[PDB]
Design a protein around this motif. Structure first.
Motif, mmCIF file in Angstrom:
data_model
loop_
_atom_site.group_PDB
_atom_site.id
_atom_site.type_symbol
_atom_site.label_atom_id
_atom_site.label_comp_id
_atom_site.label_asym_id
_atom_site.label_seq_id
_atom_site.Cartn_x
_atom_site.Cartn_y
_atom_site.Cartn_z
ATOM 1 N N UNK A 2 0.772 -1.144 -0.218
ATOM 2 C CA UNK A 2 0.099 0.112 -0.110
ATOM 3 C C UNK A 2 0.787 1.199 0.006
ATOM 4 N N UNK A 3 2.176 1.161 -0.270
ATOM 5 C CA UNK A 3 3.183 2.360 0.060
ATOM 6 C C UNK A 3 3.832 2.448 -1.330
ATOM 7 N N UNK A 4 3.299 3.237 -2.347
ATOM 8 C CA UNK A 4 3.974 3.286 -3.599
ATOM 9 C C UNK A 4 3.519 4.803 -4.185
ATOM 10 N N UNK A 5 3.181 5.644 -3.387
ATOM 11 C CA UNK A 5 2.613 7.052 -3.602
ATOM 12 C C UNK A 5 3.785 8.088 -3.262
ATOM 13 N N UNK A 6 3.960 9.235 -4.028
ATOM 14 C CA UNK A 6 4.990 10.241 -3.367
ATOM 15 C C UNK A 6 4.736 11.348 -4.306
ATOM 16 N N UNK A 7 5.072 12.523 -4.146
ATOM 17 C CA UNK A 7 4.719 13.813 -4.760
ATOM 18 C C UNK A 7 6.056 14.316 -5.420
ATOM 19 N N UNK A 8 6.011 15.183 -6.463
ATOM 20 C CA UNK A 8 7.309 15.792 -7.016
ATOM 21 C C UNK A 8 7.962 16.729 -6.026
ATOM 22 N N UNK A 9 9.145 17.147 -6.087
ATOM 23 C CA UNK A 9 9.871 18.002 -5.319
ATOM 24 C C UNK A 9 9.607 19.283 -5.943
ATOM 25 N N UNK A 10 9.502 20.184 -4.760
ATOM 26 C CA UNK A 10 9.232 21.630 -4.963
ATOM 27 C C UNK A 10 10.460 22.320 -5.321
ATOM 28 N N UNK A 11 11.780 21.807 -5.498
ATOM 29 C CA UNK A 11 13.064 22.598 -5.779
ATOM 30 C C UNK A 11 13.192 23.681 -4.794
ATOM 31 N N UNK A 12 12.844 23.467 -3.518
ATOM 32 C CA UNK A 12 13.204 24.454 -2.518
ATOM 33 C C UNK A 12 14.750 24.419 -2.352
ATOM 34 N N UNK A 13 15.240 25.387 -1.334
ATOM 35 C CA UNK A 13 16.575 25.722 -1.120
ATOM 36 C C UNK A 13 17.019 27.264 -0.949
ATOM 37 N N UNK A 14 18.224 27.441 -0.963
ATOM 38 C CA UNK A 14 18.681 28.754 -0.903
ATOM 39 C C UNK A 14 19.206 29.342 -2.140
ATOM 40 N N UNK A 15 18.691 30.430 -2.851
ATOM 41 C CA UNK A 15 19.226 30.900 -3.817
ATOM 42 C C UNK A 15 20.392 31.985 -3.238
ATOM 43 N N UNK A 16 20.645 32.956 -4.228
ATOM 44 C CA UNK A 16 21.494 33.819 -4.122
ATOM 45 C C UNK A 16 22.116 34.080 -2.785
ATOM 46 N N UNK A 17 23.618 33.542 -2.738
ATOM 47 C CA UNK A 17 24.170 33.431 -1.085
ATOM 48 C C UNK A 17 24.575 34.859 -0.443
ATOM 49 N N UNK A 18 25.158 34.856 0.599
ATOM 50 C CA UNK A 18 25.273 36.179 1.407
ATOM 51 C C UNK A 18 26.442 36.725 1.003
ATOM 52 N N UNK A 19 26.887 36.509 -0.163
ATOM 53 C CA UNK A 19 28.155 37.221 -0.764
ATOM 54 C C UNK A 19 28.249 37.578 -1.945
ATOM 55 N N UNK A 20 26.980 37.399 -2.696
ATOM 56 C CA UNK A 20 26.664 37.778 -4.132
ATOM 57 C C UNK A 20 25.748 38.834 -4.286
ATOM 58 N N UNK A 21 25.643 39.337 -5.535
ATOM 59 C CA UNK A 21 24.925 40.593 -5.799
ATOM 60 C C UNK A 21 23.353 40.352 -6.545
#
Lengths: 75, 139, 124, 115, 52, 174
Positions: A2-21
């Motif tokens: 009964x365990x064969x379902x999952x959802x697509x990833x949302x591509x979260x994370x951190x964009x432009x970092x703390x040293x970039x423009x």
RNA sequence: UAAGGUGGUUAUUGCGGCGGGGCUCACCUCUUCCCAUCCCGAACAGAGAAGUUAAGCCCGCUUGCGCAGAUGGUACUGCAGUUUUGUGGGAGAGUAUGUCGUCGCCUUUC
RNA sequence: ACGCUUGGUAACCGUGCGUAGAGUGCAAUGGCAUAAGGGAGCUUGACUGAGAGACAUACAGGUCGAUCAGGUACGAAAGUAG
RNA sequence: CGGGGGCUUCACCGCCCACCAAUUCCUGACAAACUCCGAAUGCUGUAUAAUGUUCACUAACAGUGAGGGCUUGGGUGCUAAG
């Protein structure tokens, strides 16, 4: 089984970092809930996404009981 | 047999045991014990634990206790026979405990050395691990 | 009672130094409590009369070029699969600190706090 | 937070979460108290305070607290319209906009200090 | 207070006792006029019985 | 205008100034409120509100419930409470009339429980709502239940407390 | 020097206990008016100055609870060969220990 | 936790301790007390014309979004509401 | 703290005794769907130093879309399987 379902990833994370423009409308952080709080020249959206307000350099500077406050130093 | 009364999940993945357990290799509340000097991790089952405990308890009839510094907390499954490979995980077969090189399993506090060596030697013949007899430093 | 221990001050600290030290039957130890922590080395033979004894002793650390240190055994590290000593940590005593120790009871061990020169060997 | 000071600190926090001020258009903080109400002009982006008014000087006539607050507001407005400050962001400092606070605000609005 | 919710019958009334003839003028919501205000004739006042 | 307020400010201040080792005038305890409540085990029976707004001259409230424990089928949000609070000269008059009449009218009234203090200085006393109170007529009532009156004071210890009450009309069974 | 207002600094800044103080702060007295309680001048608002440091507030002490925390060693790990290891990085926990804050701007004061 | 008639420590009330163990309609994760949780007053921006710049990306699709104009709601005002 | 069981009796009344036994403290220690902590490596940006189209864009044309062994981190399987 009964365990064969999952959802697509949302591509979260951190964009432009703390040293970039960034520029006036660059997405900085995609989150599920405000775990990176907005600082100066940085605002938050409906989906808790951090957007820039002016062109500058990103800076995270975790403080105040381990809470990230992303801001932008203009340049 | 020793097993949890209940737990959150029924099936647990079979991880990887990297040896040299850095916690649980010192004697406490007992002066004699047996420790694993194997080269790789092992799965001590509840049947082996109970057999070793009863073998060590029949010796030294009523003198001293037998501290068991281990607990079979993880479930190990086994699918039935004559079944092809893969229709989901099988039903939980038994319960076991991870034993890494250096872990102490049994301890005796009451009996003297002459009896505590014989009892632990009699109990170590029911475990699938090479065991050495350790004595406490403050003795 | 009291024991004596002649050590050697370590000139280099790190991983290569510890490897070359343990490849020769030596044991690195540290001693703290005074001005600065001092790292020395024992020949692994000054012990077995302080670690494996069921009594309470006080060590007199003498580095040769230094002086009497008057330490107490505080921390021991052992190997899991070989029971060999890997590190020892000592606490200094000079004249008065109300030091805390573990004393075996006489007819396991009780924690006591007393002056360096007023520690009992066994309580009854 | 119910000790008549924590309750005011909470209001001050959730007001300062949106009220601030640069060198131009500074902040106007008010402090009430049992007597001699005070007001001040603060620059939160750079520190230094610009000006400050209080009902302790040789300019205030005795009377009701509402009239005293109106006079203090007129005084602070006339003092701030000297250097060139024309706009302000009036906060409350944890006080309801009614009574002496509103009297000070109206006395400042009758004069200049566009806000 | 808030005018229009509380009972307006909260007036001054006498509590003249019957045993010792003690008259206490109180304010309550309660018969007829005794001397100058309504009166409530009762049996046992604050000073009527022992333990008082 | 009330009697007991003047009596307090005239005699009890000086009475508690001595016999307790007090120095400042702002250190003697005082009565803050006389809040009285009543529970209703009816989960249209809210006659208790009209009953309580007769002996106090002040309106009461409903105080809807918060816990939804299905043991009593409460379904949190029910009118089970009254909770009328008096902390003024209204409270002074109510306490006056209560201690002078209808407190000494209980069947075999031996006083009050001397150990009903919660240790903080407050005093919670429960009455069974006889015809004692001279505001009801015992005619159109459904034998309304009692009350759980609570005198909240300023006293810090139970020893310092109960003295402001013994200096008043309340008998403490001794 | 002292107090009040308002900010920066991730509790070494907090909590508690013990003593001291009041030109400003605070309790304190009243509810005609402005304003409010799903009931109450309790809170908010207004009108005053008989009293008070009792409390809030501010100072000095306290390792008590909290918070911070080494040196050394260990686990783990990148690269190279392999039963061994060599080169670099290097924790967590624990011990000694530290902490009863610090930095600005305005008004009255000395 | 301590007190109080029904009422029983699990109904309501009073006084303390309680940084979050509650709640956020509905699964789980993340977040939230200087509230995103709860209440009261007024309202319909659950508007029109639109999209600087980005994140995902075989395509079809998908997500966030700042300024400007025309008229609005709340608010003393800043300001918020697509 | 309290509930179940033996004797003493008008009174699961006042008692006396041994087990399972709430809460608190001290130790030993587990977890992919636990975290008060937390690396090495990897990823991103700027500059520098080595190598020089290896990079990126447009047009045209294809094939491929059955993979496998070895080392390392894992799931399933019996820490079995070429």
């Amino acid at each position: 089984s009964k365990n064969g379902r999952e959802s697509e990833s949302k591509r979260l994370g951190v964009k432009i970092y703390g040293g970039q423009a960034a520029i006036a409308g660059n997405i900085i952080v995609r989150q599920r809930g405000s775990k990176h709080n907005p600082g100066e020249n940085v605002y938050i959206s409906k989906d808790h996404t951090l957007h820039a307000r002016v062109a500058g350099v990103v800076k995270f500077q975790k403080k105040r009981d381990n809470k990230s406050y992303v801001s932008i130093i203009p340049f | 047999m020793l097993q949890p009364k209940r737990t959150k999940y029924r099936k647990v993945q079979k991880g990887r045991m990297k040896g040299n357990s850095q916690r649980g290799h010192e004697l406490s509340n007992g002066m004699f014990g047996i420790k694993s000097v194997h080269e790789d991790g092992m799965f001590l089952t509840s049947r082996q634990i109970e057999a070793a405990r009863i073998a060590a308890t029949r010796y030294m009839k009523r003198e001293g206790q037998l501290w068991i510094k281990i607990f079979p907390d993880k479930p190990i499954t086994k699918k039935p026979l004559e079944v092809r490979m893969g229709k989901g995980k099988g039903a939980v077969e038994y319960w076991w405990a991870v034993v890494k090189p250096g872990r102490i399993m049994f301890e005796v506090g009451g009996v003297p050395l002459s009896v505590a060596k014989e009892a632990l030697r009699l109990a170590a013949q029911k475990l699938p691990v090479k065991t050495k007899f350790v004595v406490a430093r403050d003795f | 009672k009291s024991i004596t221990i002649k050590g050697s001050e370590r000139e280099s600290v790190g991983k290569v130094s510890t490897k070359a030290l343990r490849n020769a039957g030596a044991v690195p130890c540290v001693l703290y409590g005074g001005n600065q922590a001092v790292h020395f080395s024992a020949d692994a033979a000054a012990f077995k009369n302080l670690v494996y004894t069921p009594n309470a002793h006080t060590v007199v650390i003498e580095l040769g070029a230094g002086k009497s240190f008057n330490a107490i055994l505080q921390d021991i590290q052992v190997h899991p699969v070989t029971d060999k000593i890997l590190h020892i940590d000592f606490f200094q005593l000079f004249d008065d600190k109300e030091i805390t120790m573990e004393v075996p009871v006489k007819i396991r061990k009780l924690k006591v706090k007393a002056l360096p020169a007023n520690i009992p060997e066994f309580v009854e | 937070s119910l000790t008549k000071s924590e309750r005011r600190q909470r209001i001050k926090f959730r007001i300062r979460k949106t009220i601030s001020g640069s060198a131009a258009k500074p902040r106007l903080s008010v402090f009430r108290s049992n007597k001699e109400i005070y007001a001040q002009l603060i620059d939160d982006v750079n520190g230094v305070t610009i000006l400050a008014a209080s009902s302790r000087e040789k300019e205030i006539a005795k009377g009701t607290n509402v009239e005293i607050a109106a006079a203090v507001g007129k005084l602070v407005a006339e003092k701030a319209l000297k250097a060139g400050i024309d706009t302000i962001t009036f906060d409350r400092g944890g006080y309801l906009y009614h009574g002496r606070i509103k009297s000070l605000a109206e006395g400042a609005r009758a004069a200049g200090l566009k806000f | 207070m808030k005018k229009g919710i509380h009972p307006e019958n909260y007036r001054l009334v006498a509590f003249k006792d019957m045993s010792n003839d003690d008259v206490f003028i109180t304010k309550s919501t309660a018969e007829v006029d005794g001397v100058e205000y309504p009166v409530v004739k009762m049996e046992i006042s604050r000073t009527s019985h022992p333990f008082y | 205008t009330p009697r007991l307020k003047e009596e307090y400010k005239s005699r009890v201040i000086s009475a508690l100034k001595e016999e307790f080792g007090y120095t400042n005038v702002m250190q003697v305890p005082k009565l803050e409120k006389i809040v009285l409540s009543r529970g209703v085990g009816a989960a249209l029976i809210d006659y208790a509100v009209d009953e309580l707004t007769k002996i106090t001259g002040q309106k009461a409230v409903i105080t809807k419930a918060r816990k939804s424990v299905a043991g009593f089928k409460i379904r949190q949000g029910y009118p089970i409470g009254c909770k009328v609070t008096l902390r003024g000269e209204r409270m002074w008059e109510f306490f006056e009339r209560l201690i002078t009449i209808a407190v000494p009218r209980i069947r075999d009234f031996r006083g009050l429980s001397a150990k009903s203090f919660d240790g903080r200085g407050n005093y919670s006393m429960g009455v069974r709502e006889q015809i004692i109170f001279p505001e009801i007529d015992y005619d159109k009532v459904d034998r309304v239940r009692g009350m759980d009156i609570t005198f909240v004071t300023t006293a810090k210890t139970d020893k310092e407390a109960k003295s402001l009450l013994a200096e008043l009309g309340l008998p403490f069974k001794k």
